[PDB]
């Protein structure tokens, strides 16, 4: 018998799916939004570079 209130087995290792990690962390813009603004364009370029990196 293992101690009462304790887990008999060790917690399961968490394996990372790189495809899912990329999908949740750096997901692509869902629509091709209209970045006519000067600041929107700069932000779009920065977001693209960060996602590529």
């Amino acid at each position: 018998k293992h101690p009462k209130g304790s887990h008999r087995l060790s917690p399961k290792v968490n394996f990372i799916d790189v495809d899912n990690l990329i999908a949740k962390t750096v997901a692509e813009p869902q629509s091709i939004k209209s970045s006519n603004g000067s600041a929107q364009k700069v932000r779009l370029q920065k977001a693209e570079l960060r996602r590529k990196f």
Partner: protein, 235 residues
């Protein structure tokens, strides 16, 4: 993984669900340039209270269970401690029975000796009446009684000789038979080994298959097993 240790249970039954386990680990002592064993006693959780003092157990790290308890019993490698408890209980019953039987065999022996001390008749005198009545023809009722004191219904010269037999006599004949067997076994094997042809035949006669193709030790044992199967089984 969780840190596991091996240790000997050194205390049990003093705390509820807790045992003390002695863990020895190997360390190097730089000062004396020697690899030493370092000992420490661990308070260990025993959920099922199965472990007993003397058992060899493996303890596994767990969550904090108390101020000083951080390990639990994970497996009983050897259960010598549990065996001790079982053998002690059985011993009390086993010894009581034997002592009772021996006490009854002592009182019986005492009674027999006391009964014999109540019979003034003595072996010498009784054997002097069975040898005078058998040489004179008189048959006083004492003889009939003597035929009951000893069970010797018939009074002949070959009945007093069987009343006075000593165990030593039997031992002397058993010893001669024992000596004969050993001497015969040795002479038989000694002769067999001296003659390889008679040896090969000997093995085949007793049921060996191609004894010729055998080693000295692999075949001398067969000869010894056979010589001791031809002088101890037939007798």
């Amino acid at each position: 993984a969780r840190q596991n240790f091996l240790g000997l249970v050194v205390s049990q039954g003093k705390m509820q669900k807790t045992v003390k386990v002695r863990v020895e680990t190997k360390v190097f002592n730089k000062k004396i340039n020697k690899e030493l064993f370092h000992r420490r006693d661990y308070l260990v959780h025993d959920e099922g209270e199965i472990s007993r003092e003397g058992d060899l157990v493996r303890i596994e790290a767990t969550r904090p269970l108390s101020k000083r308890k951080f390990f639990a019993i994970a497996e009983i490698i050897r259960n010598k401690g549990q065996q001790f408890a079982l053998y002690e209980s059985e011993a009390q019953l086993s010894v009581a029975k034997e002592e009772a039987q021996k006490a009854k065999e002592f009182l019986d022996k005492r009674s027999v000796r006391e009964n014999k001390l109540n019979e003034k008749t003595t072996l010498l005198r009784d054997i002097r009446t069975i040898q005078d009545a058998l040489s004179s023809g008189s048959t006083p009722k004492e003889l009939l009684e003597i035929k009951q004191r000893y069970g010797i219904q018939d009074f002949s010269q070959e009945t007093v000789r069987q009343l006075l037999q000593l165990d030593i006599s039997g031992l002397e004949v058993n010893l001669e038979k024992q000596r004969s067997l050993i001497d015969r076994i040795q002479t038989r094997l000694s002769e067999l080994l001296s003659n390889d042809l008679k040896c090969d035949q000997f093995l085949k006669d007793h049921g060996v298959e191609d004894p010729l193709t055998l080693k000295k030790n692999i075949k001398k044992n067969l000869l010894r097993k056979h010589v001791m199967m031809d002088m101890q089984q037939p007798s």
